[PDB]
Write a protein that binds this ligand. Structure first.
Ligand SMILES: *[C@@H]1O[C@H](CO)[C@@H](O[C@@H]2O[C@H](CO)[C@@H](O)[C@H](O)[C@H]2NC(C)=O)[C@H](O)[C@H]1NC(C)=O
Ligand SMILES: *[C@@H]1O[C@H](CO)[C@@H](O)[C@H](O)[C@H]1NC(C)=O
Ligand SMILES: *[C@@H]1O[C@H](CO)[C@@H](O)[C@H](O)[C@H]1NC(C)=O
Ligand SMILES: *[C@@H]1O[C@H](CO)[C@@H](O)[C@H](O)[C@H]1NC(C)=O
Ligand SMILES: [Zn+2]
Ligand SMILES: [Zn+2]
Ligand SMILES: [Zn+2]
Length: 383
């Protein structure tokens, strides 16, 4: 019995460091990451969704749905029913119908009477189902990490405070791309992320939120090494005028021209021993990447570490991702600290579709139908 009602702090701050492979924690000393491990929960490897790209996987975290179901199937995709294109190269991401096949968690959260704050998380500056996060930032990669943390802290400590915060950062994906995960120069990059994590922990303690807030550190995918010796040249096997390349590598989404499907499909099946070609209808079920109109007729998947380009002279990056989600190189991290989470606990694996049911349970809101299970991840909690 208490004379004041005890505060129920169903609060979550969800942080994503883009492209943080599961084993980056061990490439260099990561005291702040191990600090959370010591007083929180830690999953050695997360199984994310296929394709293992940024936007498909971030949306899975806020919907609990496979890519075929929530509709963000790739960073580049073409809608044949609407004759519309979605691309990141020029931030052509604001066509709400591309996002509206599912409901992100911040909408469900706000429909339940709460408020949400977003700091550059993919899709939070897009109008979905006519709505935005209660607070959000227009996407601008130049905005420093410290400025993004400032808005999150502000919104958590305001007169009307948010109960859900989304924080996003472009590293170490960017550096992992240009350097390659094998580069020794990644050490300074990873250590910087650990520094940035520590800065976030300091600001949270300074703001008196540290013991009242469930902090979750995760990522969308990992990274794998590419090579000039592991290239696959479409011009060697195909006439560029016979198809349209909707998405390139390592999962090529090919839309053959009128009547050229059989010619294209035959050329690609016998093209290369490290390129596996599927008809849209033959895509392995375990990827859950087939039952959507934005899946192109042909899906050609390169093996791990192999890169697809149209001309062998084209540019390519030493690190890349998007391969089969069963690969360990594509698996991100998962850390969490908070009043709801155990202390010094570790789990071998977790399915990334299980974050959504967990986030809703922590927030005491009702989840939309999803493809995860709260029961898979309930052993992360004190009750
Ligand atoms: C992932 O979850 C969604 C929603 O729970 C499933 O899609 C539903 O499937 C049922 C029956 O197949 C339909 O009646 C609904 O209309 C579907 N909803 C949506 C939004 O598509 C989907 O089948 C699940 N995927 C897997 C692999 O289990
Ligand atoms: C990004 O943000 C900074 C600070 O608000 C601003 O000066 C800069 O012009 C922005 N960049 C773009 C492309 O809007
Ligand atoms: C590429 O194909 C060869 C067969 O020629 C196979 O042995 C190898 O395992 C493949 N590469 C990968 C990364 O699986
Ligand atoms: C992940 O999901 C698969 C099938 O959806 C299931 O068999 C497996 O046990 C799950 N793993 C975890 C760690 O929840
Ligand atoms: Zn990413
Ligand atoms: Zn990337
Ligand atoms: Zn870059």
């Amino acid at each position: 019995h208490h004379h004041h009602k005890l505060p129920d702090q169903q609060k979550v701050l969800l942080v994503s460091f883009d492209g943080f492979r599961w084993d980056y924690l061990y490439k260099v000393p990561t005291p702040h990451f191990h600090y959370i491990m010591k007083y929180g929960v830690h999953v050695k490897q997360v199984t994310n969704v296929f394709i293992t790209k940024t936007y498909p996987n971030h949306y899975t975290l806020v919907t609990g749905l496979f890519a075929e179901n929530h509709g963000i199937v790739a960073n580049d995709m073409f809608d044949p029913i609407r004759n519309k294109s979605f691309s990141l190269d020029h931030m052509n991401i604001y066509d709400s119908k591309f996002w509206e096949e599912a409901t992100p968690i911040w909408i469900t959260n706000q429909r339940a009477g709460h408020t949400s704050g977003a700091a550059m998380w993919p899709g939070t500056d897009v109008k979905i189902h006519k709505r935005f996060p209660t607070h959000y930032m227009p996407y601008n990669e130049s905005v420093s990490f410290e400025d993004r943390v400032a808005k999150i802290i502000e919104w958590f400590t305001s007169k009307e405070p948010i109960n859900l915060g989304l924080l996003y950062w472009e590293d170490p994906d960017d550096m992992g791309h240009h350097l390659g995960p094998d580069s020794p120069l990644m050490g300074p990059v990873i250590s910087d992320i650990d520094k940035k994590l520590g800065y976030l922990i300091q600001m949270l303690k300074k703001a008196k939120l540290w013991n009242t807030l469930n902090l979750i550190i995760t990522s969308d995918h990992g990274m794998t090494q590419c090579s000039e010796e592991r290239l696959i040249e479409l011009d060697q096997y195909l006439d560029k005028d016979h198809y349209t390349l909707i998405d390139q590598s390592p999962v090529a989404a090919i839309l053959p021209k009128e009547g050229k499907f059989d010619e294209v499909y035959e050329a690609l099946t016998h093209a290369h021993p490290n390129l596996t070609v599927y008809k849209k209808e033959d895509v392995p079920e375990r990827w859950h990447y087939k039952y959507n109109s934005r899946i192109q007729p042909i899906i050609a998947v390169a093996d791990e570490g192999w890169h697809i380009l149209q001309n062998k002279s084209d540019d390519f990056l030493l690190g890349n991702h998007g391969y089969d989600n069963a690969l360990a190189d594509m698996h991100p991290i998962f850390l969490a600290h908070g009043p709801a989470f155990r202390k010094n606990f570790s789990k071998e694996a977790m399915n990334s579709t299980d974050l959504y049911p967990l986030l809703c349970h922590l927030l005491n809101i009702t989840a939309m139908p999803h493809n995860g299970s709260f029961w898979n991840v309930q052993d992360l909690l004190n009750s």
